[PDB]
Amino acid sequence: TTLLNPYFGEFGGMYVPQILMPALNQLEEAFVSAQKDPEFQAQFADLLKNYAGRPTALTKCQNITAGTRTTLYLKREDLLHGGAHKTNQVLGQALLAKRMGKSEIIAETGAGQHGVASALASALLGLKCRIYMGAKDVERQSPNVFRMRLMGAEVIPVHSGSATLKDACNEALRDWSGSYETAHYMLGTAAGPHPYPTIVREFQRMIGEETKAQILDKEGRLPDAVIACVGGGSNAIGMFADFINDTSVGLIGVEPGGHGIETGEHGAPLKHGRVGIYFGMKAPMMQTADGQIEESYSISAGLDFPSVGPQHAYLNSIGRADYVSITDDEALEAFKTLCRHEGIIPALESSHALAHALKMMREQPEKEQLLVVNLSGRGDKDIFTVHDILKARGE
Amino acid sequence: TTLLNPYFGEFGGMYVPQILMPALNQLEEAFVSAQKDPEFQAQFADLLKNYAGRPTALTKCQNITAGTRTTLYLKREDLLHGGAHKTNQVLGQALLAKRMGKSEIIAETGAGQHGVASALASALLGLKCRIYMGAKDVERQSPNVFRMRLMGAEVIPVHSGSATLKDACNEALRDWSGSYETAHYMLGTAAGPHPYPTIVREFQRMIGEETKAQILDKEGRLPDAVIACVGGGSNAIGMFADFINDTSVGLIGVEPGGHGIETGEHGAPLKHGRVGIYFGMKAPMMQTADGQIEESYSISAGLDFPSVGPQHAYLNSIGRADYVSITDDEALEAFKTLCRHEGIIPALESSHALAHALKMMREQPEKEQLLVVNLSGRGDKDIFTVHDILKARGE
Amino acid sequence: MERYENLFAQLNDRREGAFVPFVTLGDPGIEQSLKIIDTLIDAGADALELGVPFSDPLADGPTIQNANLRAFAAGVTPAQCFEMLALIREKHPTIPIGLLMYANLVFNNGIDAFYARCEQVGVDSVLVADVPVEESAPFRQAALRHNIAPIFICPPNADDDLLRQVASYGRGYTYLLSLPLHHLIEKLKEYHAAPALQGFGISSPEQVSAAVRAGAAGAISGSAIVKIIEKNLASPKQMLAELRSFVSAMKAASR
Amino acid sequence: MERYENLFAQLNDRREGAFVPFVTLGDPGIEQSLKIIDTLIDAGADALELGVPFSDPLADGPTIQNANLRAFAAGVTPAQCFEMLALIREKHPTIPIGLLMYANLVFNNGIDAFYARCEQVGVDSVLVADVPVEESAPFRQAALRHNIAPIFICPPNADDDLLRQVASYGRGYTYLLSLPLHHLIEKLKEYHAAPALQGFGISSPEQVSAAVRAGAAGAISGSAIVKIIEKNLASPKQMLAELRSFVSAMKAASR
Ligand SMILES: Cc1ncc(COP(=O)(O)O)c(/C=N/[C@@H](CO)C(=O)O)c1O
Ligand SMILES: Cc1ncc(COP(=O)(O)O)c(/C=N/[C@@H](CO)C(=O)O)c1O
Ligand SMILES: [Cl-]
Ligand SMILES: [Cl-]
Ligand SMILES: [Cl-]
Ligand SMILES: [Cl-]
Ligand SMILES: [Cl-]
Ligand SMILES: [Cl-]
Ligand SMILES: [Cl-]
Ligand SMILES: [Cl-]
Ligand SMILES: [Cl-]
Ligand SMILES: [Cl-]
Ligand SMILES: [Cl-]
Ligand SMILES: [Cl-]
Ligand SMILES: [Cl-]
Ligand SMILES: [Cl-]
Ligand SMILES: [Cl-]
Ligand SMILES: [Cl-]
Ligand code: NA
Ligand code: NA
Ligand code: NA
Ligand code: NA
């Protein structure tokens, strides 16, 4: 028995060992309670405003659309404290942890942004934070590992399996199964077992709510489409949620195409994977023909979650949202273009969303369209990667 | 003849070659005109709000003051686009450049933050940007150099003199003397020849204006003191300006003490230098006994300007503002403390201001005091430096 | 078939607990795994619990994580595991054979088809480690349609609702991971549950006798057998010797 | 003293322009600098303009930036420069000696004291490169109190107000950096300015004759002498030979 529906159509559920079910049920009850509690909402609002810096700007980008009939806005989650959208929902989940009387936080991270967000929230709110991270990721994300450590979090390398995000995901669930009486599992995306896809959406939905109010103020109408990258699904469902019932507004999610879908070296399970059951949910997976879970490949470290949130799989199945992919090279071009023409260095994750908006514009330059791209993070973290590529090419 | 007073008491002036006087006079006239122009003010406001992300948060920091009668707020210029306060006044100066019909920008930078701000503003507003940077600084600020280049700016290493900030300052003035018909010199601090100390203050004064409104809303009274680091003086005069006539509010500027004032390896000319004439102004200088200009030493790359803005020298002389110093070790402690206890990674420049507020608290823990520290920037840029120190110590 | 029913009837007649070792199929290779399993049986295993290597065994601790890595290093696939199962059953007609599976491997090519293959090779039960009773309906239904017992874990944080559901839904045995132990065991009996096997930290003979004394039908060694494999990789012969010594001692303790 | 007045009177009588070389004191060392300066004089320099090495010569291009670096490499200080000036004057009683200074070196130990030292060693003029007429009052006053001519630059972007101010404030000569050239020169005369020397890009004899033809009293070679030093560092003897050849040719062009 649950209070809320664990499924989005056929997708989602609570596919965990029996021992973890009480932890999920406890968390769902706490969330449902919190959502009706004006005191909780006020505390969350206070942290978002006065600590994280909400509301974030909605920036009109005039240079990049010159000579076309596209108007493009960027929702500036890159300006949130920590440098990405991840901060919003960690502050909400840290408050849920406290509501439940927990004093410890467990988190998984791949690229390190969710780990940093979890560590900063834990430091502010007096929680002891431990972060699982695949050993291969630890090795390639020394800067983020160091930020996490400066903020007092324990970073635990995971050597099992592929030593990447999925393996860190498993380790976090293993820990929580034993520790849930005192520890909360701060899952970093809109995926995993119920109630996480629901909680993460509700604690990211201010992205779309603010976007709607901002675009109404500036343009007097809703956007033709809102566009967001999809790794596990949090920034995209945060932008989409408040527009779901506005049926004229397109919802476009962009998965990483990597070296190209046809190479198989990508991270686009929603459109090019196969439904499976893993990490507590039934959803599209990167997996072998015989059902072993595989990694997502992308230039962008943050689009590495090898599945996708079940609400995205559902919105796609009913035709409410459309999902596309953007290759490494397309994302890199978009990165360069925004730096040079708007003076904003975007995360390479977010660059996938921008690349698709640029394609919408360039393909049909005399189509009148009002687009919003969710700029999920800043790209300071990516300048070394980009530097190394441009050198290798001979640029 | 000028429209405005070029001096703050005995400090300031226009000590440039005769050939540059028309450029300064032109800039002063354009500024005076712009300040009366509602269209200019609206364009500036639009960029600050919708591009840079103003207003910035005022964050109450509860953990670090626990068990004392200090209440400490941080003004969050670290959340501005670009990651420091430098962005505010570059947007205003880029608009002045356009007002004057200029299509090119020249800027100097030491640590690279002003260079990045100049490059981003130039990219957004369609100006061709060239940045002078001492060769020694270029070598040690490869990340910032690369951001500047990604944003389409030309970065020109300066090999003359000490190959640092002062030499880049000279080169920018040399260029401008020849190019001022088409180029604007985007000076990065509240120093140099009139009208720059005035313009930079007026284009940074929203820091203090917002702080005042925010603290009135949250506490119902003015702060006992506002505290800011002083390299050349921009972030500090931006915080101070709106409080100057509120005589109960302390104005505390913090210069870098480096290895300690007594070592002579510091950057605290206002309190420990000697008045001289250089870079277009009469002000306290780092200089030899026989009048050669010397470098400022600090852990923090950004507190390297070897003089100080003339309005600071004036406010000190009349007793309106007080200036103190903080050593490398004190700044590093403050950096660590804010990361661990508030989940905010501060610039090492800003860490000097925080260190002095922590000293005010710790020295007199039963003194009731309401303090604001200007957090001039984020400290992502500093994590390698900090990492390297902690390793060397054995931490 | 009725392999668990027949086993428990026989043990009950002999006033004897069951001892059930777990191993990962194909660890440390197919040939050696087949030999290990025959050694467990010869040494007195009453039933087997057998894992199929999976990329992401999020219910398993380090010992079994490493067994999976060894099996993968040997190139072991689920298809090869099913070939192994057919050979094991062909050699040993009465011993109950249970699988411990992850949901994705069951769902991958169709849940019904998975349980049909289990039936074809002569498997008796399947415990799906990441399917709680709340999500179990299609798995239990397919199991029962193909004469396979669906096995459920009764965890240490179980409540009365869960006890009733496990008692209703499970067959073969109840996997006890242990409310007081005496409470759980009596309540499972009260609710006519499949006989309980204690599965928590069973690594010594004393724990087998203790499980039986508490009123359980026997004990499952979830990782102790795998630890012996790990420790003896360099000596296949010594590995089999220690396995035999261990299983013999554990079985002796069930009397 | 009246060294510039006497020089211009003598040149006017000979229908002759002045040729004035610039060099940095102590470049490439004190001894060689003294020899360079004596060579310039022997070769026909009418007056000297002499720089004191400064850390931040923000009015100077690369040639002079590098001369300063060479002098600093030799350990040259302002005090040593003043010792040099006294020795130069002691050898050469009538030649006008002008300094090109940065404001900080003048202000450092007191503006009045700086001009008093200038008078003691026999300097005739000081041009402070980063002091525009607008800021010049304390410098001009101290200069005149110590019998030193304050020299001002009339730049290419000069206006009538500036021409009047320079004409009023300057003494010795006006430093012309060149409104049309004919306009500036006639207007300076109209306003009774100190005689004009053309200082922009004077690197060839033809430019000296051109300056005189335009109505200027002569020409200042702002960097050409320093370039010859730069090019001949490895050969002190060849350096002096080329310096002599160059100055002789430039002076010949003033007739
Ligand atoms: C800046 C940014 N944008 C988008 C995403 C994509 O995540 P959603 O789809 O929005 O949930 C990420 C993810 N990062 C994770 C995984 O490595 C992490 O940091 O641990 C990100 O850092
Ligand atoms: C984050 C930060 N805080 C404070 C200061 C100090 O400058 P004011 O005193 O506020 O003008 C700086 C300076 N940086 C200059 C010089 O290297 C630059 O980037 O070019 C800074 O980057
Ligand atoms: Cl409470
Ligand atoms: Cl640390
Ligand atoms: Cl509303
Ligand atoms: Cl409108
Ligand atoms: Cl699919
Ligand atoms: Cl206009
Ligand atoms: Cl580039
Ligand atoms: Cl007001
Ligand atoms: Cl109040
Ligand atoms: Cl002083
Ligand atoms: Cl048998
Ligand atoms: Cl199912
Ligand atoms: Cl007994
Ligand atoms: Cl003489
Ligand atoms: Cl003065
Ligand atoms: Cl002639
Ligand atoms: Na357009
Ligand atoms: Na994904
Ligand atoms: Na307090
Ligand atoms: Na300074």
Side-chain angles (χ1 to χ4, degrees):
Chain A
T1 312
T2 58
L3 295 174
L4 302 179
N5 190 345
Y7 283 87
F8 300 88
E10 75 205 82
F11 305 102
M14 299 169 78
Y15 292 95
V16 297
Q18 194 71 57
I19 192 169
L20 269 176
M21 289 294 298
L24 295 176
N25 289 144
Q26 171 194 43
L27 175 61
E28 184 199 47
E29 192 282 348
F31 171 72
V32 168
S33 187
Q35 289 291 87
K36 290 181 294 196
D37 181 354
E39 175 66 22
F40 181 97
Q41 297 305 314
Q43 287 183 30
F44 188 23
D46 180 8
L47 291 169
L48 291 167
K49 177 175 174 204
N50 297 305
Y51 178 77
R54 300 212 72 84
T56 62
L58 185 75
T59 304
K60 192 181 163 182
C61 288
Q62 272 179 323
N63 297 325
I64 57 178
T65 60
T68 79
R69 300 204 176 272
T70 292
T71 300
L72 177 60
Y73 285 85
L74 308 182
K75 179 62 168 164
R76 299 295 301 288
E77 297 301 297
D78 61 302
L79 294 179
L80 201 63
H81 177 49
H85 72 289
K86 296 294 191 180
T87 297
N88 295 316
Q89 74 101 14
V90 292
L91 288 167
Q93 285 202 54
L95 290 175
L96 282 182
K98 294 177 57 221
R99 187 182 186 86
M100 290 187 293
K102 314 281 172 94
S103 59
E104 302 189 2
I105 291 300
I106 301 158
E108 85 292 338
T109 195
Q113 251 326 100
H114 178 64
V116 170
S118 299
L120 63 90
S122 295
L124 174 67
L125 296 167
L127 300 168
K128 188 99 172 201
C129 179
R130 60 192 180 265
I131 297 165
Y132 292 95
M133 192 171 187
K136 291 186 169 79
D137 290 322
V138 168
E139 195 276 342
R140 59 190 172 205
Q141 305 287 345
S142 296
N144 274 340
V145 170
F146 188 63
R147 293 178 175 95
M148 285 176 247
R149 290 175 174 156
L150 278 167
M151 285 186 301
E154 178 179 21
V155 179
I156 308 170
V158 176
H159 299 274
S160 50
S162 66
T164 57
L165 175 53
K166 73 187 178 64
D167 317 280
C169 287
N170 309 328
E171 195 65 18
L173 288 181
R174 293 176 187 122
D175 180 339
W176 197 38
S177 77
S179 65
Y180 74 90
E181 294 180 309
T182 58
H184 174 59
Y185 175 36
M186 190 174 275
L187 210 164
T189 191
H194 177 78
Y196 287 103
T198 296
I199 295 177
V200 175
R201 175 193 71 233
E202 291 299 312
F203 288 174
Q204 285 296 356
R205 74 176 298 115
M206 66 286 307
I207 298 174
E209 288 173 348
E210 289 174 12
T211 297
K212 176 182 295 183
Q214 287 169 312
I215 200 90
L216 284 171
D217 177 60
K218 297 168 181 301
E219 293 288 340
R221 67 168 189 109
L222 294 171
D224 294 308
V226 299
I227 307 144
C229 69
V230 176
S234 64
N235 88 89
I237 204 72
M239 175 59 84
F240 293 175
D242 205 53
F243 294 104
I244 289 167
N245 293 340
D246 299 299
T247 64
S248 70
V249 176
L251 309 175
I252 304 172
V254 183
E255 301 188 283
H259 297 310
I261 298 302
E262 75 292 341
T263 70
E265 298 172 354
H266 60 81
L270 194 157
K271 297 303 290 295
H272 302 286
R274 189 172 65 257
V275 177
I277 300 171
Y278 165 66
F279 192 49
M281 59 174 186
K282 182 179 298 184
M285 300 290 163
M286 303 291 299
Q287 54 173 321
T288 66
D290 64 353
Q292 308 294 0
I293 312 301
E294 292 190 292
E295 293 167 67
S296 277
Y297 169 74
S298 178
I299 189 161
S300 73
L303 301 183
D304 57 340
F305 182 74
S307 181
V308 65
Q311 187 167 12
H312 290 292
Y314 172 69
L315 288 168
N316 179 57
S317 72
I318 69 170
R320 176 65 190 93
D322 301 298
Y323 297 82
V324 299
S325 63
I326 283 292
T327 65
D328 286 357
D329 285 352
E330 291 169 319
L332 283 162
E333 180 265 309
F335 176 101
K336 287 167 48 185
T337 291
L338 194 68
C339 289
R340 179 179 282 285
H341 291 100
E342 299 295 340
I344 301 167
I345 306 183
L348 281 172
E349 295 79 11
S350 320
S351 295
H352 284 73
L354 179 60
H356 186 73
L358 293 172
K359 184 178 288 185
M360 291 168 71
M361 174 183 76
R362 293 165 181 165
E363 285 187 2
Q364 307 187 305
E366 296 297 321
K367 181 178 183 181
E368 195 178 345
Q369 55 193 328
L370 175 59
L371 303 183
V372 180
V373 161
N374 198 27
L375 210 71
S376 62
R378 60 169 169 256
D380 301 72
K381 66 193 176 62
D382 294 308
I383 65 165
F384 295 90
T385 295
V386 174
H387 174 270
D388 292 353
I389 287 152
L390 300 185
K391 211 166 188 293
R393 286 179 175 178
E395 294 181 34
Chain B
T1 312
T2 58
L3 295 174
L4 302 179
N5 190 345
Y7 283 87
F8 300 88
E10 75 205 82
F11 305 102
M14 299 169 78
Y15 292 95
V16 297
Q18 194 71 57
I19 192 169
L20 269 176
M21 289 294 298
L24 295 176
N25 289 144
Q26 171 194 43
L27 175 61
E28 184 199 47
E29 192 282 348
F31 171 72
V32 168
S33 187
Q35 289 291 87
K36 290 181 294 196
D37 181 354
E39 175 66 22
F40 181 97
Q41 297 305 314
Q43 287 183 30
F44 188 23
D46 180 8
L47 291 169
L48 291 167
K49 177 175 174 204
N50 297 305
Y51 178 77
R54 300 212 72 84
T56 62
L58 185 75
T59 304
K60 192 181 163 182
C61 288
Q62 272 179 323
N63 297 325
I64 57 178
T65 60
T68 79
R69 300 204 176 272
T70 292
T71 300
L72 177 60
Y73 285 85
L74 308 182
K75 179 62 168 164
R76 299 295 301 288
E77 297 301 297
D78 61 302
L79 294 179
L80 201 63
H81 177 49
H85 72 289
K86 296 294 191 180
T87 297
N88 295 316
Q89 74 101 14
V90 292
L91 288 167
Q93 285 202 54
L95 290 175
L96 282 182
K98 294 177 57 221
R99 187 182 186 86
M100 290 187 293
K102 314 281 172 94
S103 59
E104 302 189 2
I105 291 300
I106 301 158
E108 85 292 338
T109 195
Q113 251 326 100
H114 178 64
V116 170
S118 299
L120 63 90
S122 295
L124 174 67
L125 296 167
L127 300 168
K128 188 99 172 201
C129 179
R130 60 192 180 265
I131 297 165
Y132 292 95
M133 192 171 187
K136 291 186 169 79
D137 290 322
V138 168
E139 195 276 342
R140 59 190 172 205
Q141 305 287 345
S142 296
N144 274 340
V145 170
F146 188 63
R147 293 178 175 95
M148 285 176 247
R149 290 175 174 156
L150 278 167
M151 285 186 301
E154 178 179 21
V155 179
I156 308 170
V158 176
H159 299 274
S160 50
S162 66
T164 57
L165 175 53
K166 73 187 178 64
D167 317 280
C169 287
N170 309 328
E171 195 65 18
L173 288 181
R174 293 176 187 122
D175 180 339
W176 197 38
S177 77
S179 65
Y180 74 90
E181 294 180 309
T182 58
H184 174 59
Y185 175 36
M186 190 174 275
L187 210 164
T189 191
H194 177 78
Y196 287 103
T198 296
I199 295 177
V200 175
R201 175 193 71 233
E202 292 299 312
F203 288 174
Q204 285 296 356
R205 74 176 298 115
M206 66 286 307
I207 298 174
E209 288 173 348
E210 289 174 12
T211 297
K212 176 182 295 183
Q214 287 169 312
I215 200 90
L216 284 171
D217 177 60
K218 297 168 181 301
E219 293 288 340
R221 67 168 189 109
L222 294 171
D224 294 308
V226 299
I227 307 144
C229 69
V230 176
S234 64
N235 88 89
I237 204 72
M239 175 59 84
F240 293 175
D242 205 53
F243 294 104
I244 289 167
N245 293 340
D246 299 299
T247 64
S248 70
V249 176
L251 309 175
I252 304 172
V254 183
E255 301 188 283
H259 297 310
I261 298 302
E262 75 292 341
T263 70
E265 298 172 354
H266 60 81
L270 194 157
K271 297 303 290 295
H272 302 286
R274 189 172 65 257
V275 177
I277 300 171
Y278 165 66
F279 192 49
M281 59 174 186
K282 182 179 298 184
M285 300 290 163
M286 303 291 299
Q287 54 173 321
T288 66
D290 64 353
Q292 308 294 0
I293 312 301
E294 292 190 292
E295 293 167 67
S296 277
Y297 169 74
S298 178
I299 189 161
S300 73
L303 301 183
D304 57 340
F305 182 74
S307 181
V308 65
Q311 187 167 12
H312 290 292
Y314 172 69
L315 288 168
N316 179 57
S317 72
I318 69 170
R320 176 65 190 93
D322 301 298
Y323 297 82
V324 299
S325 63
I326 283 292
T327 65
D328 286 357
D329 285 352
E330 291 169 319
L332 283 162
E333 180 265 309
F335 176 101
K336 287 167 48 185
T337 291
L338 194 68
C339 289
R340 179 179 282 285
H341 291 100
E342 299 295 340
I344 301 167
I345 306 183
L348 281 172
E349 295 79 11
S350 320
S351 295
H352 284 73
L354 179 60
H356 186 73
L358 293 172
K359 184 178 288 185
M360 291 168 71
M361 174 183 76
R362 293 165 181 165
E363 285 187 2
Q364 307 187 305
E366 296 297 321
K367 181 178 183 181
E368 195 178 345
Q369 55 193 328
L370 175 59
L371 303 183
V372 180
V373 161
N374 198 27
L375 210 71
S376 62
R378 60 169 169 256
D380 301 72
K381 66 193 176 62
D382 294 308
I383 65 165
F384 295 90
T385 295
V386 174
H387 174 270
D388 292 353
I389 287 152
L390 300 185
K391 211 166 188 293
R393 286 179 175 178
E395 294 181 34
Chain C
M1 304 293 292
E2 310 90 60
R3 296 194 184 80
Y4 286 107
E5 296 94 316
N6 292 340
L7 173 64
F8 289 122
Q10 295 156 5
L11 291 174
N12 190 57
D13 264 292
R14 300 203 308 269
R15 309 288 213 78
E16 188 163 313
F19 173 67
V20 179
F22 169 88
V23 291
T24 298
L25 287 162
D27 170 26
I30 296 179
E31 191 183 347
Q32 180 72 358
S33 183
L34 287 172
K35 287 170 188 172
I36 287 161
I37 289 163
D38 284 351
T39 295
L40 303 179
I41 299 172
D42 192 60
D46 292 299
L48 302 170
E49 196 194 36
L50 298 174
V52 172
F54 182 58
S55 57
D56 294 85
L58 61 82
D60 282 293
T63 302
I64 292 159
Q65 290 164 31
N66 284 323
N68 278 7
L69 283 171
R70 290 192 297 271
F72 284 128
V76 170
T77 63
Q80 286 174 350
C81 290
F82 271 80
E83 292 158 24
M84 288 178 77
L85 288 167
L87 297 170
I88 296 160
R89 171 59 63 207
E90 195 181 16
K91 285 181 293 186
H92 303 286
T94 63
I95 188 167
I97 297 174
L99 303 188
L100 182 292
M101 296 303 303
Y102 282 88
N104 197 54
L105 292 181
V106 177
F107 178 84
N108 187 59
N109 200 42
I111 294 177
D112 193 77
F114 182 85
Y115 286 97
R117 185 78 172 120
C118 286
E119 184 178 25
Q120 181 179 45
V121 302
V123 161
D124 300 292
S125 67
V126 172
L127 195 184
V128 192
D130 51 348
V131 175
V133 297
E134 295 81 351
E135 291 283 5
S136 66
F139 296 90
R140 290 184 286 118
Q141 291 150 7
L144 293 167
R145 283 191 301 268
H146 295 281
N147 296 297
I148 305 297
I151 309 287
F152 292 101
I153 294 164
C154 181
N157 54 7
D159 62 12
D160 191 71
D161 286 336
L162 185 50
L163 287 171
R164 291 175 177 270
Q165 272 184 292
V166 168
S168 173
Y169 292 167
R171 296 288 207 288
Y173 60 84
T174 306
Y175 196 128
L176 234 192
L177 220 44
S178 178
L179 277 169
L181 171 63
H182 56 82
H183 186 266
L184 291 174
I185 289 172
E186 324 283 55
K187 293 304 275 183
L188 283 167
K189 288 179 177 170
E190 181 190 340
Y191 300 151
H192 306 289
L197 299 182
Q198 173 65 245
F200 177 70
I202 300 298
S203 62
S204 72
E206 185 152 55
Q207 288 156 346
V208 179
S209 54
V212 170
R213 195 158 51 243
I220 298 160
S221 193
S223 62
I225 307 299
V226 182
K227 196 77 173 157
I228 293 173
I229 295 165
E230 176 184 324
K231 267 140 48 202
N232 289 281
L233 288 169
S235 179
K237 168 166 58 72
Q238 186 67 26
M239 188 193 286
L240 298 177
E242 190 174 358
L243 284 171
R244 172 178 303 275
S245 179
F246 182 75
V247 173
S248 177
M250 294 293 278
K251 181 55 205 174
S254 71
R255 294 138 180 154
Chain D
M1 304 293 292
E2 310 90 60
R3 296 194 184 80
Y4 286 107
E5 296 94 316
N6 292 340
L7 173 64
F8 289 122
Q10 295 156 5
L11 291 174
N12 190 57
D13 264 292
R14 300 203 308 269
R15 309 288 213 78
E16 188 163 313
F19 173 67
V20 179
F22 169 88
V23 291
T24 298
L25 287 162
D27 170 26
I30 296 179
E31 191 183 347
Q32 180 72 358
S33 183
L34 287 172
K35 287 170 188 172
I36 287 161
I37 289 163
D38 284 351
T39 295
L40 303 179
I41 299 172
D42 192 60
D46 292 299
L48 302 170
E49 196 194 36
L50 298 174
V52 172
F54 182 58
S55 57
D56 294 85
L58 61 82
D60 282 293
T63 302
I64 292 159
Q65 290 164 31
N66 284 323
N68 278 7
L69 283 171
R70 290 192 297 271
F72 284 128
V76 170
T77 63
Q80 286 174 350
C81 290
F82 271 80
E83 292 158 24
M84 288 178 77
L85 288 167
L87 297 170
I88 296 160
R89 171 59 63 207
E90 195 181 16
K91 285 181 293 186
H92 303 286
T94 63
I95 188 167
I97 297 174
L99 303 188
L100 182 292
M101 296 303 303
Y102 282 88
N104 197 54
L105 292 181
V106 177
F107 178 84
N108 187 59
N109 200 42
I111 294 177
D112 193 77
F114 182 85
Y115 286 97
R117 185 78 172 120
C118 286
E119 184 178 25
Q120 181 179 45
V121 302
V123 161
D124 300 292
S125 67
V126 172
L127 195 184
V128 192
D130 51 348
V131 175
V133 297
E134 295 81 351
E135 291 283 5
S136 66
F139 296 90
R140 290 184 286 118
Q141 291 150 7
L144 293 167
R145 283 191 301 268
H146 295 281
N147 296 297
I148 305 297
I151 309 287
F152 292 101
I153 294 164
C154 181
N157 54 7
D159 62 12
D160 191 71
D161 286 336
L162 185 50
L163 287 171
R164 291 175 177 270
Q165 272 184 292
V166 168
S168 173
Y169 292 167
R171 296 288 207 288
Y173 60 84
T174 306
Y175 196 128
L176 234 192
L177 220 44
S178 178
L179 277 169
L181 171 63
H182 56 82
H183 186 266
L184 291 174
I185 289 172
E186 324 283 55
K187 293 304 275 183
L188 283 167
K189 288 179 177 170
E190 181 190 340
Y191 300 151
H192 306 289
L197 299 182
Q198 173 65 245
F200 177 70
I202 300 298
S203 62
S204 72
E206 185 152 55
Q207 288 156 346
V208 179
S209 54
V212 170
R213 195 158 51 243
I220 298 160
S221 193
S223 62
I225 307 299
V226 182
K227 196 77 173 157
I228 293 173
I229 295 165
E230 176 184 324
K231 267 140 48 202
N232 289 281
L233 288 169
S235 179
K237 168 166 58 72
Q238 186 67 26
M239 188 193 286
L240 298 177
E242 190 174 358
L243 284 171
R244 172 178 303 275
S245 179
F246 182 75
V247 173
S248 177
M250 294 293 278
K251 181 55 205 174
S254 71
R255 294 138 180 154

